[PDB]
């Protein structure tokens, strides 16, 4: 058993994953500088932990091209890592906040007719709370659209919106690996953006309903290791998004769940095909 | 038969596609301002002609989510529209220029050890020959990487390279729709970058080998309407890239082939 771990910087989660991988066999730490294709790689599975989502996607795809299975897969990283592709996959299967997508600012100006104000504008490929805007009226919508337009990263031309959900000072972050619920936390914040990368504080979540909803959300994709983001609302639990490069250090500490161990175990199972 | 056409501006392409669609049935011209999802669309098929590649990709996926088939599909638009994903799909099946991909500046610095100089650096998602660089030495490589580093787009951090191929003052552009070869042209230029978008001149290409190779290249994807780019080298024909939102106004003019008609005929086949 030779397990690759693909990384940018060795965070607490990567070190934990390295340690667990060592229990099952030989670990090969691949910094991004070590990644050159086509190339000769002697690996049974690669655990993809690149900080950049796009780098993770392309490294997954490239390892697959060499006949090397990858956790997560390029398909999952693509579909789960893009907010629009992901809600489309979730839309059948689990409750989600009301959303709208538009392809131009003219179309985007009609979104409040469906969703009303306030609404949330967010980029399709973002993480850690980047460029989220709470938009309360026409003036801010225009402002947000004007700014998205002059940024000239063409991904910002996909206009994705949700209704603003009234949360109770927190949201929920859940974890499902290979279909198994491994744990969940609340992330508290006095601002509507609750990320722990933005100062959110975590405590454990034992709500039986989120375990059930999390597994369903995972099943909408049917593979891999996913961090799941859930909102408590007036109309019950809502699945906001799904994250194919889970951070978990505070989650594992708070809950006592071995996220790194479960991720490695799932990777050895995919290695065994 | 009710056929949607999504567009940004009505190019010659889109006017011809609309006329041809009108011969089959009802046409619904959908500017990007008319695209709002989830929504209610009454359409049997949608022909995707948005100028932005990413807008084409997402509008295809969105119509798919409403149960409406799309030409091209979101899958094909992503796989063929990304140079790295596209060459990985091609490399099994057809000759391609030698290539290398790195995930960081440090890895990219090793690419000359495999490819040698000169090499070509190009972005993974580009079109019209934009941001192509012919890199003749290490100083040039470093300059390109430094500039890519300081650009916003995280996609510029996927470093894709090819050997520089000595072409005979032109390259070839081929069209395959539904597995059927529809036509080819030479694109001539005094510069190594031959795009008609940058002033390349079209001449008709009747070479039977480009027809054969083009069909094979299409078969690597197995669906849709593709514009295929082929290089002539001292090793023979090489497939460079594939393009899922084909421009054809000049190719059609020069060859007398009906790219718009074949496109539409394939879309209604796909609809039913």
């Amino acid at each position: 058993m030779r397990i690759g771990i693909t990384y940018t910087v060795l965070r607490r989660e990567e070190m934990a994953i390295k340690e667990r991988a060592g229990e099952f066999g030989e670990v090969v730490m691949l910094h991004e500088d070590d990644l050159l294709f086509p190339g000769n790689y002697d690996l049974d599975v690669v655990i993809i932990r690149n900080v950049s989502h796009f780098k993770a996607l392309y490294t997954a795809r490239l390892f697959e091209s060499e006949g090397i299975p990858t956790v997560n897969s390029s398909r999952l990283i693509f579909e789960a890592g893009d907010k629009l592709f992901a809600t489309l996959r979730l839309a059948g299967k689990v409750p989600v906040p009301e959303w709208k997508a538009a392809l131009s600012e003219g179309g985007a100006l009609r979104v409040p007719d469906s969703l009303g104000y306030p609404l949330v504008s967010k980029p399709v490929f973002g993480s850690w709370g980047r460029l989220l805007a709470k938009v309360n009226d026409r003036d801010s919508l225009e402002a947000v659209l004007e700014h998205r337009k002059w940024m000239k990263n063409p991904l910002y031309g996909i206009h994705y919106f949700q209704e603003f959900v009234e949360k109770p000072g927190r949201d929920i972050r859940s974890y499902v690996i290979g279909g198994e619920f491994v744990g969940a936390i609340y992330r508290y914040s006095n601002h509507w953006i609750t990320n722990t990368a933005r100062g959110g504080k975590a405590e454990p979540c034992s709500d039986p309903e989120v375990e059930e909803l999390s597994v369903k959300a995972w099943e909408a994709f049917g593979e891999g290791a996913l961090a799941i983001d859930i909102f408590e609302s007036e109309k019950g639990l809502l699945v906001n998004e799904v994250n194919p490069n889970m951070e978990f250090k505070n989650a594992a500490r708070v809950t006592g769940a071995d996220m790194a161990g479960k991720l490695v175990e799932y990777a050895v199972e995919v290695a065994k095909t | 038969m009710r056929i949607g056409i999504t567009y940004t501006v009505l190019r010659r392409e889109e006017m011809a596609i609309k006329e041809r669609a009108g011969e089959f049935g009802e046409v619904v011209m959908l500017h990007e301002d008319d695209l709002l999802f989830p929504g209610n669309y009454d359409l049997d098929v949608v022909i995707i002609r948005n100028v932005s590649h990413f807008k084409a990709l997402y509008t295809a996926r969105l119509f798919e989510s409403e149960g409406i088939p799309t030409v091209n599909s979101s899958r094909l638009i992503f796989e063929a529209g990304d140079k790295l994903f596209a060459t990985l799909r091609l490399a099994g099946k057809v000759p391609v220029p030698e290539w290398k991909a790195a995930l960081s500046e440090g890895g990219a610095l090793r690419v000359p050890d495999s490819l040698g100089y000169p090499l070509v650096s190009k972005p993974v998602f580009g079109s019209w020959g934009r941001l192509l660089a012919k890199v003749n030495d290490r100083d040039s490589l470093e300059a390109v990487l430094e500039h890519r580093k300081w650009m916003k787009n995280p996609l510029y951090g996927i470093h894709y390279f090819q050997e520089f191929v000595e072409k005979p003052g032109r390259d070839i552009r081929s069209y395959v729709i539904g597995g059927e070869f529809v036509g080819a042209i030479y694109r001539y230029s005094n510069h190594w970058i031959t795009n008609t978008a940058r002033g390349g001149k079209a001449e008709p290409c009747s070479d039977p080998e480009v027809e054969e190779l083009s069909v094979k290249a299409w078969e690597a994807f197995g669906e849709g309407a593709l514009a295929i780019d082929i290089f002539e080298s001292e090793k023979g024909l090489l497939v460079n890239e594939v393009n899922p939102n084909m421009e054809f106004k000049n190719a059609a003019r020069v060859t007398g082939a009906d790219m718009a008609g074949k496109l539409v005929e394939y879309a209604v086949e796909v609809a039913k």
Partner: peptide
């Protein structure tokens, strides 16, 4: 000297 935080960094 941690490198620049980019548009796609995270989870």
């Amino acid at each position: 000297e941690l490198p620049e935080v980019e548009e796609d960094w995270g989870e």
